[PDB]
Design an enzyme around this catalytic site. Structure first.
Site, PDB file in Angstrom:
ATOM      1  N   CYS A   1     -33.927  11.137  43.694  1.00 24.08           N
ATOM      2  CA  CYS A   1     -33.452   9.838  43.287  1.00 24.08           C
ATOM      3  C   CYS A   1     -32.035   9.813  42.699  1.00 24.08           C
ATOM      4  CB  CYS A   1     -34.263   9.216  42.077  1.00 24.08           C
ATOM      5  SG  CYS A   1     -35.956   8.706  42.713  1.00 24.08           S
TER       6      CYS A   1
ATOM      7  N   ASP B   1     -36.316   2.365  39.008  1.00 22.85           N
ATOM      8  CA  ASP B   1     -37.509   1.502  38.653  1.00 22.85           C
ATOM      9  C   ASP B   1     -36.957   1.005  37.289  1.00 22.85           C
ATOM     10  OD1 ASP B   1     -39.633   0.936  36.746  1.00 22.85           O
ATOM     11  OD2 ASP B   1     -40.847   2.017  38.216  1.00 22.85           O
TER      12      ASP B   1
ATOM     13  N   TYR C   1     -34.613  19.423  40.759  1.00 23.29           N
ATOM     14  CA  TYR C   1     -33.038  19.327  40.049  1.00 23.29           C
ATOM     15  C   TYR C   1     -32.709  20.950  39.803  1.00 23.29           C
ATOM     16  CZ  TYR C   1     -33.794  14.397  40.630  1.00 23.29           C
ATOM     17  OH  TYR C   1     -34.035  13.058  40.860  1.00 23.29           O
TER      18      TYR C   1
ATOM     19  N   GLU D   1     -37.204  18.297  29.619  1.00 21.52           N
ATOM     20  CA  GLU D   1     -36.833  17.948  31.123  1.00 21.52           C
ATOM     21  C   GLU D   1     -35.622  18.617  31.542  1.00 21.52           C
ATOM     22  OE1 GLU D   1     -36.192  14.539  33.037  1.00 21.52           O
ATOM     23  OE2 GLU D   1     -37.622  15.011  34.621  1.00 21.52           O
TER      24      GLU D   1
ATOM     25  N   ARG E   1     -29.826   6.408  44.004  1.00 24.12           N
ATOM     26  CA  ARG E   1     -30.203   5.861  45.148  1.00 24.12           C
ATOM     27  C   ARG E   1     -31.349   4.824  44.940  1.00 24.12           C
ATOM     28  NH1 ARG E   1     -34.764   7.223  47.679  1.00 24.12           N
ATOM     29  NH2 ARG E   1     -35.726   9.085  46.508  1.00 24.12           N
TER      30      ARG E   1
ATOM     31  N   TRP F   1     -43.750  16.295  35.652  1.00 27.91           N
ATOM     32  CA  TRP F   1     -43.959  16.763  37.131  1.00 27.91           C
ATOM     33  C   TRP F   1     -45.148  17.151  37.341  1.00 27.91           C
ATOM     34  CZ3 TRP F   1     -39.533  16.436  39.983  1.00 27.91           C
ATOM     35  CH2 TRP F   1     -38.458  15.725  39.437  1.00 27.91           C
TER      36      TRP F   1
HETATM   37  O1  LIG Z   1     -36.216   9.368  37.186  1.00 33.69           O
HETATM   38  C1  LIG Z   1     -36.548   8.384  38.108  1.00 33.69           C
HETATM   39  C2  LIG Z   1     -37.638   8.894  39.022  1.00 33.69           C
HETATM   40  C3  LIG Z   1     -38.085   7.875  40.014  1.00 33.69           C
HETATM   41  N1  LIG Z   1     -37.583   6.636  39.728  1.00 33.69           N
HETATM   42  C4  LIG Z   1     -38.188   5.755  40.825  1.00 33.69           C
HETATM   43  C5  LIG Z   1     -37.296   5.161  41.847  1.00 33.69           C
HETATM   44  C6  LIG Z   1     -38.128   4.510  42.781  1.00 33.69           C
HETATM   45  O2  LIG Z   1     -38.557   3.219  41.792  1.00 33.69           O
HETATM   46  C7  LIG Z   1     -39.354   5.287  43.016  1.00 33.69           C
HETATM   47  C8  LIG Z   1     -39.165   6.180  44.317  1.00 33.69           C
HETATM   48  O3  LIG Z   1     -39.273   5.425  45.421  1.00 33.69           O
HETATM   49  P1  LIG Z   1     -38.002   6.185  46.502  1.00 33.69           P
HETATM   50  O4  LIG Z   1     -36.850   5.730  46.016  1.00 33.69           O
HETATM   51  O5  LIG Z   1     -38.212   7.619  46.838  1.00 33.69           O
HETATM   52  O6  LIG Z   1     -38.287   5.498  47.724  1.00 33.69           O
HETATM   53  O7  LIG Z   1     -39.376   6.216  41.817  1.00 33.69           O
HETATM   54  C9  LIG Z   1     -36.835   6.045  38.747  1.00 33.69           C
HETATM   55  O8  LIG Z   1     -36.196   4.984  38.818  1.00 33.69           O
HETATM   56  N2  LIG Z   1     -36.368   7.258  37.777  1.00 33.69           N
END
Ligand SMILES: O=c1ccn([C@H]2C[C@H](O)[C@@H](COP(=O)(O)O)O2)c(=O)[nH]1
Ligand SMILES: O=c1ccn([C@H]2C[C@H](O)[C@@H](COP(=O)(O)O)O2)c(=O)[nH]1
Lengths: 316, 316
Positions: free
Chosen positions: A198, A221, A146, A60, A218, A82
């Site tokens: 993100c 998870d 990205y 990736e 921003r 993806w």
């Molecule tokens: O590499 C990644 C991609 C996505 N997310 C998560 C962030 C959030 O948990 C969710 C996306 O929600 P929004 O922030 O777009 O609202 O996916 C991660 O932690 N890491």
């Protein structure tokens, strides 16, 4: 241990995270504002308390570095991360003449048979992308992702900026620049995207011959995302340091909304009852240096002896 | 006390900051990566350990909120913070028929007479801007500065985006959005600017009816810059919370390169021998709510009883 900051973050979100509704309504325990640092000179921050597929991280990141936006590259290395963004387009297209896949995700998560028919269409779709170039060019190209934000930022002037390529020269020519920043956040594109970047922005910083990197995430998870996120960026820190002939410093991880979806609580708890083992080491090809031309074999993880992988619902 | 995080930051940069050369060669003691939070429910984070001109903060923030890019507005309230960016243009223009002001800054800092002649041209320049509209439209308009980045981001499509105006509606309609972000960093503009936006990006976050804001500052002057920086953003947090009818939460300050120029060492040390007094309170106009139409009298600082102001060389 090296990964302690991650474990401490989980602990924290469990103790003082407040319930906050989210776009998927799977509930979260959130905190806003947090920072973890990792001394890369001490080891590679790939979690030992649970098995994290380093291969998915390599492919990736490389895909990003090539400025690639087509999924075909990923599928070639069996990376499916993806697959759904592309699949979505195929599903919602007038060329798509098949079963009703109204946002497959939620329905496949429940309907056992839907999961099968849906899985046919995905396996099928991936097949077309891999073999059919006209198909791949059309449905396999994500577009704003990205690789293009980093390497082909579009300008009003009509052309395109290679943010990252210019930034590496900046480190070579002006290592003390307080402006070594790469933004993935474009205001005009942000509202049309299914998922706004993100990993919004990152900054490099050179001191004492060591290269550091700070990442502004921003949203995160805690259980499923962060483990990968930490690896992608610490690896990039190494790759750039390699290209620039610098030592590796620290990887600083800054979060906005760090959260634990409610269905990962048992899993994260169990995760916490485990003891970190000594960290792995990263070894990179000494001869090859133009990291943009890099490939799988040029990067290797040594001594990664993790604990078994923890299964969790992607109710994310 | 409320301002302790700032004092602790200074302490830290003094203890483990490493010498790092900078664009002005005035030497710095740097650290990379740091985060301070401020519970706005406890008071307004205007430094009590040294007098900080709250008036300059008000007018400047308002100038930003109006989407204004012309210095004329600032000079009307005797705010001269941005005077030099404009002055520079006048000085390097073919219409400028006067004394040689080769980067006045460094020469005025040393030559006593240059400071006087240079000061004439500045007083003169400011005068033209304030009275002559054709002049102001030309030399008083900075162009790419916070007001336009926040409120009039240009698009390839030819038009302009009001990042901030859309974001406030986002909080009103979707308070739990993990995307309430305003970026001041545009890759295509970044290389032509005399000074790329220090305050690169910020994110809002609503929980429990409280509004929080996190700021990503790529570079910071610990002594002279940070005191203002903390006030501008904590104030904006209040203004948006006011507009949106929310409670004020926390202001989280994330830094990239936080540094102390070497000529501020005595001053910061003396600063540290002082004890913070109880913090001031901010009171805003209850009736008026469209913060974009706000003005000086609509915002007032209560109980700001600081220590005397500490003089320092703007060898920045
Ligand atoms: O590499 C990644 C991609 C996505 N997310 C998560 C962030 C959030 O948990 C969710 C996306 O929600 P929004 O922030 O777009 O609202 O996916 C991660 O932690 N890491
Ligand atoms: O509101 C402001 C404006 C500027 N600076 C500082 C940051 C750096 O000390 C210097 C700019 O240097 P660069 O980051 O552009 O390299 O001015 C602040 O701290 N606060």
């Amino acid at each position: 241990m090296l990964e302690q900051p991650y474990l401490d973050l989980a602990k924290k979100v469990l103790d003082e995270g407040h319930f906050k509704p989210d776009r998927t309504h799977t509930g979260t325990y959130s905190i806003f504002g947090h920072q973890m640092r990792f001394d890369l000179s001490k080891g590679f921050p790939l979690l030992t308390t649970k098995k994290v597929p380093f291969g998915l991280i390599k492919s990736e990141l490389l895909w990003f570095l090539h400025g690639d936006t087509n999924i075909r590259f990923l599928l070639q290395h069996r990376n499916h991360i993806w697959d759904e963004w592309a699949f979505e387009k195929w599903v919602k297209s007038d060329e798509y003449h098949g079963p009703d896949m109204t946002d497959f995700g939620h329905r496949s998560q429940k309907d056992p048979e839907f999961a099968a028919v849906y899985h046919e269409e995905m396996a099928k779709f991936d097949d077309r992308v891999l073999h059919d170039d006209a198909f791949a060019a059309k449905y396999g190209d994500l577009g704003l992702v990205y690789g293009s934000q980093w390497r082909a930022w579009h300008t009003s002037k009509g052309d395109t900026i290679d943010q990252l390529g210019d930034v590496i020269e900046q480190i070579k020519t002006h290592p003390y620049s307080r402006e070594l920043i790469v933004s993935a956040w474009n205001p005009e594109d942000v509202p049309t995207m299914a998922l706004p970047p993100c990993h919004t922005l990152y900054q490099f910083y050179v001191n004492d011959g060591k290269l550091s990197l700070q990442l502004y995430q921003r949203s995160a998870d805690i259980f499923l995302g962060v483990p990968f996120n930490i690896a992608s960026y610490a690896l990039l820190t190494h790759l750039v340091a390699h290209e620039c002939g610098l030592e590796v410093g620290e990887f600083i991880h800054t979060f906005g909304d760090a959260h634990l979806y409610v269905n990962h609580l048992d899993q994260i708890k169990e995760q916490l009852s485990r003891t970190p083992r000594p960290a792995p080491t990263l070894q990179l090809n000494p001869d090859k240096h133009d990291i943009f031309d890099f490939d799988m074999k040029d990067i290797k993880l040594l001594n990664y002896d993790p604990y078994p992988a923890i299964k969790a619902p992607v109710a994310v």
